[PDB]
Every structure is written in C-alpha cells, then in structure tokens.
Amino acid sequence: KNDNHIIQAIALLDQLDKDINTFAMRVKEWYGWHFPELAKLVPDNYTFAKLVLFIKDKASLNDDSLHDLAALLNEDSGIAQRVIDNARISMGQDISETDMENVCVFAQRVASLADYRRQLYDYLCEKMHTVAPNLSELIGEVIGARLISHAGSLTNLSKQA
Amino acid sequence: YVLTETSAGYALLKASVLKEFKIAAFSKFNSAANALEEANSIIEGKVSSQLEKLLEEIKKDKKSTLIVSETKLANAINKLGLNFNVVSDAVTLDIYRAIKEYLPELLPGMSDNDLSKMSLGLAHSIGRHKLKFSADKVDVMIIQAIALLDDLDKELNTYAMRCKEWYGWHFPELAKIVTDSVAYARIILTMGIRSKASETDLSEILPEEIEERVKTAAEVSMGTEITQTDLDNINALAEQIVEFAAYREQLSNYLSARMKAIAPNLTQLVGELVGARLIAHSGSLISLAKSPASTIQILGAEKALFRALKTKHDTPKYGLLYHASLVGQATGKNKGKIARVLAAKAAVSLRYDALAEDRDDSGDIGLESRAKVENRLSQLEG
Amino acid sequence: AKVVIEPHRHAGVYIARGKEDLLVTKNMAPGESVYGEKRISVEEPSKEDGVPPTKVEYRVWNPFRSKLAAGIMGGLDELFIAPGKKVLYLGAASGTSVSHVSDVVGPEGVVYAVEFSHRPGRELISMAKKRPNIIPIIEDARHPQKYRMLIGMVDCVFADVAQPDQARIIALNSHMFLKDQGGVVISIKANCIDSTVDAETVFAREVQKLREERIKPLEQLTLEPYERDHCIVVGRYMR
Amino acid sequence: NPKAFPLADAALTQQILDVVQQAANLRQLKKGANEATKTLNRGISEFIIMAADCEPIEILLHLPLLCEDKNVPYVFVPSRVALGRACGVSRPVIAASITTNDASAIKTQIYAVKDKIETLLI
RNA sequence: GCGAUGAUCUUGACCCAUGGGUGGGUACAAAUGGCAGUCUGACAAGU
C-alpha cells in the first residue's frame, strides 16, 4: 500500500527542511543581535539553537559553570574554547527576556521539526526496505523513492520504458 | 602633586616640579559600573571613591600642594579636614598633556587596545542612559514577526493539506463533513482509527449534529486499514499541527505586549495587526510620521493607484484600511469619508507615538480620538 | 568591462576611472544603508590556491555631501587624514558623514563623534553598533575638562563647526588633546557666521585668530562653487 | 513650550500675517499640515508658517526637520486664531505654506520676509 | 573466454598553440531597475 504515502513522506520531508531553514535564519539573526560572535562561529541549526535555548546569556555561557558545552559537545573541543574566548570579548546588545522567550519558542520548533524529520527518515528507510527491497539494494532509498514520486506508483514505473 | 583623571582609576604623580615621567601612586577602578559612575563623576564634578582614598593614603609629602584640573574638585578638597593647599593653576600643561602619553606604560596590565574597547562599550551604555532608551531604538522585530505569522499560516496550511491527503486513504469521508483543519486534526489525534469511536473526544470538539454525521459517516466509510506505524506518524504530525497552531497564537501574544508598549494610540484605534501592516508596509514609523495622511489613506496597492494615475481613471479608495471592522461596517457610499476621518486622526496618533512622548506615557489622547471618530460615525449614519 | 580605481595623492582616498569619475574610500562594514548608497566591488586578478583574491570594497562618496571630498577634488596634496591616525571629529549633525570619516581613517584609526544634542545621537548609536571603531559621546564640547576621561589623544583635528565662537571652541580642545605639530582641518562656512557683509574680512579676522592661537594655515582657498560661501583651512598647530 | 523656536515678535507677526493675507487674496496659500507637507514634497513652497499655540505640538514638529532638509524658511507664530483669521477662515488654522509665484506682485514683500527669516535662523 | 536477456554507435554547445575563455537551468543576496512631484482640498447637514 506504500505507493502514495512515501511520496507524502519525501515531499513532506523537503517541506520540513525548507521550513527549518526559514526559522534558522531568523534565530541566527536574533542571536546575531545579542552575541554576534557565536552565530558566526557555529553554522549549525539544531545544536546552536539549543545553545541559544539553554542559556540566553552572553556572560555565563561556558563549558563549566555552567555546562552547555559539556552536555552535547565536549569541553575538549576547539569550538568550546572559542566560546570561552568569545565570551570575554563580547560587545553585543543587552535585550530583555520576554523578547528572548519568543526565540525559545523558535528553538523548541527547531527541536520538534528535527525530531519529526528523524522519525520520518527512519520510517522512510523502513518502509522503503519493506515495499521495495531490491531497488534499495541497487540505488538506495532516496533516489528510488524519488523516481516513484516521479511515476506516482510502482505500476506506472513498471509501465514506463 | 598631580591628579590624573581617566577611566582606569585615579593616579597621583610626583614620579617618585621634580618629575621624571613616572608615577607616585595609583588607585585602580575598572568595571562597567565603575566607569559609568566615573563618567557621571566627570560631568558632575563629583568626588569618586578612589579620589577620597587617594586623598587618604598618600599625605604630608605629596599632597601639601595639590594641583587638580577641575575647579569643581578644588573646592571639595579645599573643604577636607586634612587641610591641603589646592590650586588649579597650569591645567593646560605639557606635563598634563603628557600624563596620557605614557598611560599604557604607567598602568600595569593595560595597553592602547583595551582602552578603546572599554571606552567604546562605556560609550554604548552612556549613550543608552543619556538617550534613555536602547542603542538601536529597536522596533523592527514586530515587522519581522508579522512577516513570520503569515508564514506560520501558510506552512500550517500546507501540513494541514498534507495530513488531509495521507489521512484520506483510511477514512475518506471526513473532509466533506469536517473542513476546519484543527477540528480535522484533533479527531484523529484523540481517536486514531475509525473503529475506536467514543463520545467524549467528539463532545469536546464538535457540536452534536456534526457528531452524528461523524458517527454515521464512520459507519459507512469503508476505507483502508493498515499497520499502527503509519497511525503513529499521523498522531505525530497532528501533535505537530496543534503545536504550531498554539505557536502562532503565542506569536500574537508576543505582538500584544510590543504593540501596546511601543504604539499605544495605534493599538487603541486599529489594534495590532492593522498598524503592524502599516508600519511594515511603510518600513518605519519615523518616515511614516513624515508621510502625510493622504499617503496614509492610500498605503497599499501601489500598482493599482499608480495604474489609476497613469490611466487618469477612478482611483482606488481602499488601502490597508480595507480590512478595518469599523470601516468595513460602513456602506461603501459612506465608507471612504469615515476612512478619511480615521486616517486623519490616525496620522495624528502616528505623530503622537513617533516623537517619544507617548512611549513613556502610554497614551491618553487616542481614547478621546476614538470618541471623536464614533461621534461623526453616528452623525454620518443619520 | 569594469572600472578601475586608483589612488589619489592621499592615503585611503581613492579615485575611480574613467567612465565613472567618483571619489571612493575603503569599505570596512558592508551591508549598510546610510542614505541608500551603492557600493563598488573591485579586485586584482590573481591565480592562487584556495580562495579567490579579495574584492576590496569601495563606497561612493560625494562632495555634495562632504566638504572634505570637495577639498580633495579641488586639488590637494597635503592632508593629515590617513589610515592609522587618530582624529577628533567635531560635530556630526546627522551621523551620516561619520561613516565616511571611519572609512577614510581605515581600520587602524578611532573616530570620536562629539555631539551636544539629543536628536542626531540616535543615528550615532545605531551607526556605532554596526561599525566597531566609532566612539560616540553626547558631551559639552565647550569644556574639555568634562569629557577628558572618555577620550585619549588624537593625531589630528577635523572641525565641522560653523559657529561665531568656534575659535574658542577648538582652542581649549587644541590646548588639551591635540599634540604639538599636529594638523587641523577646519571647515568654515562663510554665510553661516554672518550674512550682512562680505566674507573676506571674516576670512582675515579668522586667520588672524589662527595666528593668535598658533595655527599655521599652509593653504587656505575658496573651494570652487561645488559649495557656496565656504573655505576649508589646512594648518598645523605649533609647527 | 520650550520647543517653540524660532518665534516671531509682534511687528514681524503683523507683517507676516499681512503677507499671508495678501497671498490669500492672490490665491497663493496652503492651509493645514497636509497641504504644506505636500508642497514641501513638491518643492514649490516659498516659506512655512506655523502656530506656536497649537496644542498638541507633536503633529507639526517634523515640519522644522523637513524644512531643514529642503532649506525652506519657517518661523513660528504665537497665535492660531490669528493665523486662521489671516487665512480668511473662521477657525484656528495652525499651518500654512506660501506657494511659489515668480510673477507675483507682492514678491518683493516675500523676499523681505524671507530676509527676516534668514536673519532669524542664522 | 562479446552480446539481440542489447552487441554496436550517438544530443555538454562553441574556441585557442594536461591548461585557458564563453553558453544555459537552481538557490541566495543586492538594486542613482520601474512610482509624471506617491490622491483633490472647505464645505456639508438640518430647520
């Protein structure tokens, strides 16, 4: 029965990526206002969104007291030492907390959307291995499911020559 | 003999006039709150803490003839109980011009690099305190957020169409009855399959007359049945849709406090979204207050008005005022004149909220302006 | 084809050639909207490993917006404005020309923006948040003893004042912060001082007070009619 | 109002209201901050007249800024009842603009009043 | 230890005595790109 739901899965996944990038540019702008150094230091969306999410302060974001660089990354990473270096030379804007809470909502959207694309990817590889094992042996999941999304069905693809 | 006035503490210079381009004593201040009150102290002529400590520590050999630069500090030290002989002669002095020349070399742990950075960040904060506001005068985040809210509507609509489409296989007969996407989503998020129909989850969502069509339609719909994993993806995505539907309302709640805070009279007249589209379509409040009320009435649909000016035909009399409820309440023959009154008083409320007197006072005059609008509103309907 | 931009007889002052004849300085904080200006990206063709050679960005600059551009386009060889020097920029009056001073002073100089009014400082702080080399202060420039704490010492002084007591206003400042054999560039607007009379007597009494406060004007001239009733003075204090 | 500057003394007030009166006779006048604003956007104004007793004042504080941008003369007048009176209006008018006419017969009076304003602004 | 269960050959386009210059589709960013000069301006109602 996975002739159409997998097309919903892959096109919905592209929708998830394009929607993630939209808020991601906004949050990187916002933390560009408060602390301009780390936003140019970490181009990642999810982890940097958590880095904005846990602390909201540019004078107490360290690897120890407090631990936000020992929670996901390690303190022996070259990124974390540059967070220690950038935390001293800060010149950014001091803004209120109510403005930051809206961006905490945004980081919660980032973690949510990240969870749904992970679950969608696992369901994607799972059902692609289910309904079409041999094409997953040849050209994998993404290209084969893409070509099914071109033909619309396994039957239409089975009729093309 | 020499008092040094700078944002790194206060120093006594005897270089121990007998001077060898060195220092006699230094008493150190360095922080943001210290240099803030020191920046207050040079303006006020105010004696600081390390000025009193510098009068207290060194005495009787380097302070009997003290030369201070300010005339204000000469009288404060002149009234000290230690009885110093203090003058303010030779302020414009090459020595006094030269104490800043060896200033990285006479202060340990400092150089010319951190002095411009500390003076820069001090200049930001004293610019915040003197101008009694922020260092950017930020209002653009409302303009960004109102651009994001329609994106929430479009993306939430997109995912609503999605879950509509790959729910229609199992139970096709719901879109003909239930068209609202939230009521579409919460039924599946509570129920799941059609074979687990109950009463309470329908009762919290729908009226009874819709619920009976839902139940009898659930009897006669014989769509597909499949494994629980796809159903888990359905409850996941439905949780996501209700989640985002709460999030856009949280965004409107964020725009509530900012719109009430920054533009109170505009909030009183048209509320939040209309004036948000006014400032957003204009670009800024300060250029819009420079724009007259004739531009304010025609704000929006620039190609239609510019087309009406090229063709010299009937001008569109509807801009962003086309969606106001008090304006939409009136008939079209009487709508444009009331919109002229509302744009006319609206320009007055923009010139209220623009010039930094109602941001600190939260607005009291647009309350009278709404009454003046409603009076003429009653009169034109007569 | 593209234009080529080659330096004038000063440092940091670059002239465009030839289908565009415009005066440009080095950009150091791109993406700005000072007045809705356009920017010019030029580079040197080079074949190297890794990244391409750098597009050294230049921003357009008019004599219709600054007297300093007019003083260079009128023909100038000596100037105390160069990358690396510390300048005292007396008055700003919009905040827009401060970015041009920050561009012509290079990344090594520090621009001290002096203001005595509340209204144009709101543009000064927002300009200062973008460019991390401009220090704005809202201070009383009549008394150098009331703002000696925030500023250090400058290499040259630019005066944009046009007040009838300006020779007092610079003097206690030039006695304080300007070094010996440092340079003064003073923009004098003749009709702004007095307009009931000609300007040559004003020029004589003002250069006489420049003789009084030990200023040596190496060259004083009417600019050319790009501006009206103005003379700029390049001199040296205690030469 | 500490913000009410520059303001006209009574003799120049009578002179200016006479010139406004004759320009209203010669159909050379704009009333309201809307019409004066639009003439400032068109660059067709000779000079600007504003009332200093206009409560509130924030509806016209932008006009000195725009006249400083366009180099347009302006002096406040301390009365709005007299200002609407000289407009031939039975209401207090607070803002007026003098439209450009190089063929006007009272243009020498306009140049004299502009000499008074350029005297007061410097 | 060759293939009709496709062997075999062709739709990257131009040029220069591995190297070098153009051409087209996608995305992002920016507009001395488009806005004669971003509406008209004192009357209306009633007896």
PDB file of N, CA, C and O in Angstrom, chain C residues 162-187:
ATOM      1  N   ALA C 162      30.494  75.610  12.621  1.00  0.00           N
ATOM      2  CA  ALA C 162      30.363  76.851  11.866  1.00  0.00           C
ATOM      3  C   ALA C 162      29.723  77.920  12.751  1.00  0.00           C
ATOM      4  O   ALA C 162      28.828  78.656  12.331  1.00  0.00           O
ATOM      5  N   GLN C 163      30.167  78.011  13.993  1.00  0.00           N
ATOM      6  CA  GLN C 163      29.641  78.948  14.969  1.00  0.00           C
ATOM      7  C   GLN C 163      30.536  80.172  15.078  1.00  0.00           C
ATOM      8  O   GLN C 163      31.747  80.096  14.845  1.00  0.00           O
ATOM      9  N   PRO C 164      29.969  81.342  15.419  1.00  0.00           N
ATOM     10  CA  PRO C 164      30.804  82.554  15.529  1.00  0.00           C
ATOM     11  C   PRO C 164      31.760  82.574  16.714  1.00  0.00           C
ATOM     12  O   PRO C 164      32.554  83.518  16.820  1.00  0.00           O
ATOM     13  N   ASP C 165      31.715  81.584  17.601  1.00  0.00           N
ATOM     14  CA  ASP C 165      32.681  81.445  18.681  1.00  0.00           C
ATOM     15  C   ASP C 165      33.535  80.189  18.550  1.00  0.00           C
ATOM     16  O   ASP C 165      34.104  79.736  19.551  1.00  0.00           O
ATOM     17  N   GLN C 166      33.650  79.641  17.333  1.00  0.00           N
ATOM     18  CA  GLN C 166      34.292  78.342  17.135  1.00  0.00           C
ATOM     19  C   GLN C 166      35.783  78.397  17.436  1.00  0.00           C
ATOM     20  O   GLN C 166      36.383  77.384  17.817  1.00  0.00           O
ATOM     21  N   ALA C 167      36.385  79.584  17.315  1.00  0.00           N
ATOM     22  CA  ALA C 167      37.799  79.746  17.629  1.00  0.00           C
ATOM     23  C   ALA C 167      38.046  79.603  19.123  1.00  0.00           C
ATOM     24  O   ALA C 167      39.159  79.274  19.544  1.00  0.00           O
ATOM     25  N   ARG C 168      37.022  79.856  19.943  1.00  0.00           N
ATOM     26  CA  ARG C 168      37.109  79.472  21.346  1.00  0.00           C
ATOM     27  C   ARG C 168      36.957  77.966  21.500  1.00  0.00           C
ATOM     28  O   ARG C 168      37.711  77.333  22.251  1.00  0.00           O
ATOM     29  N   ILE C 169      36.023  77.377  20.739  1.00  0.00           N
ATOM     30  CA  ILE C 169      35.563  76.010  20.979  1.00  0.00           C
ATOM     31  C   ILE C 169      36.678  75.012  20.699  1.00  0.00           C
ATOM     32  O   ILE C 169      36.888  74.055  21.455  1.00  0.00           O
ATOM     33  N   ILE C 170      37.444  75.256  19.641  1.00  0.00           N
ATOM     34  CA  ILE C 170      38.554  74.374  19.319  1.00  0.00           C
ATOM     35  C   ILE C 170      39.722  74.599  20.274  1.00  0.00           C
ATOM     36  O   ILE C 170      40.477  73.662  20.569  1.00  0.00           O
ATOM     37  N   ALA C 171      39.839  75.817  20.834  1.00  0.00           N
ATOM     38  CA  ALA C 171      41.098  76.264  21.433  1.00  0.00           C
ATOM     39  C   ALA C 171      41.421  75.495  22.704  1.00  0.00           C
ATOM     40  O   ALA C 171      42.484  74.870  22.806  1.00  0.00           O
ATOM     41  N   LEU C 172      40.479  75.472  23.652  1.00  0.00           N
ATOM     42  CA  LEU C 172      40.637  74.672  24.863  1.00  0.00           C
ATOM     43  C   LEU C 172      40.695  73.183  24.543  1.00  0.00           C
ATOM     44  O   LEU C 172      41.241  72.397  25.323  1.00  0.00           O
ATOM     45  N   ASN C 173      40.153  72.782  23.391  1.00  0.00           N
ATOM     46  CA  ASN C 173      40.332  71.411  22.936  1.00  0.00           C
ATOM     47  C   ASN C 173      41.719  71.221  22.335  1.00  0.00           C
ATOM     48  O   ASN C 173      42.384  70.210  22.592  1.00  0.00           O
ATOM     49  N   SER C 174      42.187  72.203  21.557  1.00  0.00           N
ATOM     50  CA  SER C 174      43.500  72.076  20.930  1.00  0.00           C
ATOM     51  C   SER C 174      44.609  72.283  21.948  1.00  0.00           C
ATOM     52  O   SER C 174      45.735  71.808  21.762  1.00  0.00           O
ATOM     53  N   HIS C 175      44.305  72.991  23.034  1.00  0.00           N
ATOM     54  CA  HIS C 175      45.238  73.060  24.148  1.00  0.00           C
ATOM     55  C   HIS C 175      45.262  71.748  24.920  1.00  0.00           C
ATOM     56  O   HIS C 175      46.220  71.470  25.649  1.00  0.00           O
ATOM     57  N   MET C 176      44.212  70.934  24.784  1.00  0.00           N
ATOM     58  CA  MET C 176      44.115  69.742  25.614  1.00  0.00           C
ATOM     59  C   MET C 176      44.604  68.493  24.889  1.00  0.00           C
ATOM     60  O   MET C 176      45.580  67.864  25.313  1.00  0.00           O
ATOM     61  N   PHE C 177      43.955  68.132  23.784  1.00  0.00           N
ATOM     62  CA  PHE C 177      44.106  66.797  23.219  1.00  0.00           C
ATOM     63  C   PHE C 177      45.003  66.749  21.993  1.00  0.00           C
ATOM     64  O   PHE C 177      45.589  65.702  21.706  1.00  0.00           O
ATOM     65  N   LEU C 178      45.114  67.846  21.252  1.00  0.00           N
ATOM     66  CA  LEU C 178      45.905  67.840  20.033  1.00  0.00           C
ATOM     67  C   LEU C 178      47.376  68.007  20.377  1.00  0.00           C
ATOM     68  O   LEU C 178      47.733  68.830  21.224  1.00  0.00           O
ATOM     69  N   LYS C 179      48.226  67.222  19.720  1.00  0.00           N
ATOM     70  CA  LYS C 179      49.651  67.259  20.005  1.00  0.00           C
ATOM     71  C   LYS C 179      50.308  68.499  19.421  1.00  0.00           C
ATOM     72  O   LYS C 179      49.693  69.286  18.696  1.00  0.00           O
ATOM     73  N   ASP C 180      51.579  68.674  19.767  1.00  0.00           N
ATOM     74  CA  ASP C 180      52.420  69.611  19.045  1.00  0.00           C
ATOM     75  C   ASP C 180      52.655  69.072  17.641  1.00  0.00           C
ATOM     76  O   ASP C 180      52.636  67.857  17.427  1.00  0.00           O
ATOM     77  N   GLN C 181      52.832  69.998  16.685  1.00  0.00           N
ATOM     78  CA  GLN C 181      52.942  69.770  15.226  1.00  0.00           C
ATOM     79  C   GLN C 181      51.874  68.814  14.667  1.00  0.00           C
ATOM     80  O   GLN C 181      52.096  68.128  13.665  1.00  0.00           O
ATOM     81  N   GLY C 182      50.686  68.796  15.277  1.00  0.00           N
ATOM     82  CA  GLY C 182      49.554  68.085  14.726  1.00  0.00           C
ATOM     83  C   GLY C 182      48.762  68.968  13.784  1.00  0.00           C
ATOM     84  O   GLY C 182      48.940  70.182  13.723  1.00  0.00           O
ATOM     85  N   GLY C 183      47.841  68.345  13.051  1.00  0.00           N
ATOM     86  CA  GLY C 183      47.190  69.009  11.948  1.00  0.00           C
ATOM     87  C   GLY C 183      45.745  69.359  12.237  1.00  0.00           C
ATOM     88  O   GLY C 183      45.013  68.621  12.902  1.00  0.00           O
ATOM     89  N   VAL C 184      45.340  70.509  11.703  1.00  0.00           N
ATOM     90  CA  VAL C 184      43.972  70.994  11.814  1.00  0.00           C
ATOM     91  C   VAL C 184      43.377  71.143  10.421  1.00  0.00           C
ATOM     92  O   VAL C 184      44.012  71.682   9.505  1.00  0.00           O
ATOM     93  N   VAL C 185      42.171  70.607  10.253  1.00  0.00           N
ATOM     94  CA  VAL C 185      41.363  70.810   9.060  1.00  0.00           C
ATOM     95  C   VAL C 185      40.036  71.392   9.522  1.00  0.00           C
ATOM     96  O   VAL C 185      39.236  70.694  10.157  1.00  0.00           O
ATOM     97  N   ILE C 186      39.806  72.666   9.219  1.00  0.00           N
ATOM     98  CA  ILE C 186      38.646  73.393   9.721  1.00  0.00           C
ATOM     99  C   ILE C 186      37.767  73.772   8.538  1.00  0.00           C
ATOM    100  O   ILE C 186      38.225  74.446   7.607  1.00  0.00           O
ATOM    101  N   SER C 187      36.508  73.346   8.576  1.00  0.00           N
ATOM    102  CA  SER C 187      35.526  73.712   7.565  1.00  0.00           C
ATOM    103  C   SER C 187      34.817  74.985   8.013  1.00  0.00           C
ATOM    104  O   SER C 187      34.105  74.981   9.023  1.00  0.00           O
TER     105      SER C 187
END
